[PDB]
Symmetry: D2
Subunit: 232 residues, 4 copies
């Protein structure tokens, strides 16, 4: 697909089809294509782009944020050829990050309790990730898995007890420090050792020389990440 | 060492098959490795997907290579250069132990004088003292709408590289600091760590155009 | 004195009370009074709340930074501190408190339009007459040598006032400057080499807020990302 | 009064007594003076002093102590309540804000803590507007609605809301210095049962840069965390 951006930075995500109109023809968008510019009939100018998993997530049709999604893959030590349990799935986003990490051969197993959620998710993964390497289940989520990941309100519930090897993790993405602690206590019943709790930070700078300052506006918080390590 | 191997798991202590971050942090040294908080982010900044062809310089201890090599896949490839001989080795030695998959081609010598192909590279991951030098050599390799990401400690180098990128076909996309605010949680004691690593380096993202 | 009103959304309104004043009526607020309620709650505004809502011409210095600047200047009561520019008089109020009635704030502003609002704002909040306002550039003003305990700066080109600051400032005292761009920091720092100044501090102040409406408890989603760097230099002896 | 040096290595509090040395005698230090040379000599800042002074108990960090004043919204002439005195660090920040005509009424339960606390405040700050009391705050007899602020720094702060609310005027805050987040919620949870409308929960960060051109970067070694600041404004009864 393609990402169309203006002067302000507002971005438009387009899936071009022949005879397609965004009043701009997709043929003209493709003429330039990624790295090129197109001028509209109102003369606007919109730079044409091939989107990253970062930009797509943000403009695709409530996703897990890129900064955090990014970190989790590193938290789960996801390497190529692994199987990971996800729920999710909601709108996707974090799936793509995982599916990307497990490489064609590797599998990512995703569950989704609601229904209309998984519909949208697959649609998004469909139209960006042509590979079929994620296993989708429409439902509320032995020692065979290499990771577990959740973007639920209640990771403490579905605590996946045996569906995880030694040296594997469960990373939960919780926006309130209460939720963490409400989840952290539950590990006094299971074989786990809290290794980490952290809040990801991506501090954007504004550099338009000689202007150079951290951005006046930023998104201070999204959520915390908690890391657990199985025993045996 | 046996009880460890039969543990999985405690021992008379705890024990693990190391994760990429732990390895990196505890693996051996030649030059100071790129820290994990940024490497995690950098892979996303380069938009690395499985089957991609990424450029890299330098290797130092081989820390960045691993994050890249894991990311591009067995099919995908990481072409990576290094001009300090002892340094390339440890990266050669450190990567092989944790990454036995041979999807990483190694090179001795400056990236500046590399013999590379035009518009064959999906990304250029940079970590060295004077990034502005490889700008022409990186611009040739890189494709339209792809990125070069550089790992810069001082803000002065950021502005130096950003200034020099005027002569080359890039658009400055990002300058960012990566922050992982840690905690010490032996609950009900919960507080962010009193001791934190305040800063390693800024990340500079440059997007290629066509031409 | 002025009043501050807040609603269920946390949005705040700054009021000059009067008889017959119309907001809800005014003397109805008075009779309730600070901490009271009319659902709208009424307050004696803090120096922070004031700055963030006091009528502004030029942009006032942020409360988190102004707070830190007073500490970096090490201002105790009775000290004589220099200022430029007055802007809308925000940093001035912080400075005036710190040096007290026995002390003084010698402040310069180069724009007559800005200065009035700066003065109009100080006096509606600060009744103590320990501030001497001055019109014009600090670079052209006449000062006694080594007769100032501190120089507080908030302007775009602090490097042009370095010679007169180095003069006015006592031995071993501080000059702190409020600068948004890191490039302005480096310029000022390269220029400081040419005066009797030892560069002490370059820092970013951050007041990172939370929302606690238990059971919700987290750092605020939308935060004030950045204002400016604080650069502190100490005057030598000689 | 006191003096602080920095060496070529640039680190560290000389207390001049007649006929003594640091190797260069005190009288030599006074003559070279503030910004003078002998190691250099300076008249310490309140920030420098708090950090390098003797501490029986750990002081409030100057960035937090600085921010505590602004949240407490203290102007000259005010009467402010403090506990615990500890080593007397935050005590000095408070006293400067209220001025000669103001008052800092400060309590401290542990005697050895109050002792060196008094010695620390007095050596540095000789204006007489600090009131010391050995003992607890929840057991102190105070005038009702006669205090413009309450600065807290103890381990179980939720225990003085009742007594703090007594002293405080309408619309005046109670700002507390608390290391753990667990600590914070309990207070917010205890404050439910008291005439208090929670206004603020905030972290302070003074992020130092190292600038030695061409070198220019935020410091590798920072202070990760000290404590949260909790501001609680009182109801008009
Ligand atoms: C929104 S996604 C979380 C973010 C996701 N990782 C992403 O792509 O950014 C999770 C979605 O799955 C659904 N869901 C998750 N757990 C659920 C549960 N336990 N019961 C019902 N629905 C659930 C919710 O609709 C929610 O919107
Ligand atoms: C600081 S190390 C980075 C280590 C690596 N990123 C890691 O994670 O382990 C960077 C290395 O790049 C090398 N280098 C510097 N300039 C280079 C150049 N022009 N071409 C290739 N390597 C270079 C240096 O010798 C240095 O050892
Ligand atoms: C950002 S505003 C000051 C904000 C200040 N922190 C406050 O609370 O109002 C900058 C002001 O400094 C003044 N100024 C700029 N350059 C000056 C100079 N060289 N001498 C005196 N005043 C100056 C201008 O009038 C301008 O309104
Ligand atoms: C960590 S110190 C406080 C530090 C202080 N804010 C400073 O800047 O130096 C704790 C001290 O507070 C005192 N304290 C603790 N609880 C108290 C209470 N409930 N009432 C009065 N003092 C108390 C104890 O004497 C202890 O030595």
């Amino acid at each position: 697909p393609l990402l169309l951006k203006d002067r302000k930075g507002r971005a438009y995500l387009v899936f071009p089809k022949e005879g397609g109109v965004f009043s701009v023809p997709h043929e003209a968008l493709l003429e330039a294509g990624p790295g090129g510019v197109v001028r509209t009939h109102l003369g606007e100018e919109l730079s044409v782009h091939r989107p990253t998993l970062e930009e797509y997530l943000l403009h695709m049709k409530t996703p897990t944020a890129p900064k955090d999604a990014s970190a989790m893959v590193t938290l789960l030590d996801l390497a190529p050829g692994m199987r990971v349990l996800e729920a999710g799935t909601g709108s996707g986003g974090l799936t793509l990050f995982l599916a990307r990490a497990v490489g064609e051969k590797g599998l990512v197993e995703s569950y989704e309790a609601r229904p209309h959620h998984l519909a949208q998710a697959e649609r998004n993964v469909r139209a960006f990730w042509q590979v079929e390497n994620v296993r989708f289940h429409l439902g509320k989520l032995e020692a065979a898995y290499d990771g577990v990941a959740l973007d639920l309100m209640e990771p403490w519930k579905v605590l996946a007890a045996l569906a995880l090897k030694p040296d594997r993790f469960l990373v939960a993405y919780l926006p309130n420090i209460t939720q963490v602690l409400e989840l952290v206590r539950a590990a006094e019943a299971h074989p786990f050792r809290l290794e980490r709790v952290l809040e990801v930070g991506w501090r954007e700078w504004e550099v338009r020389l000689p202007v150079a300052h951290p951005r006046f506006q930023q998104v201070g918080h999204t959520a915390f990440l908690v890391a657990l390590r199985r025993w045996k």
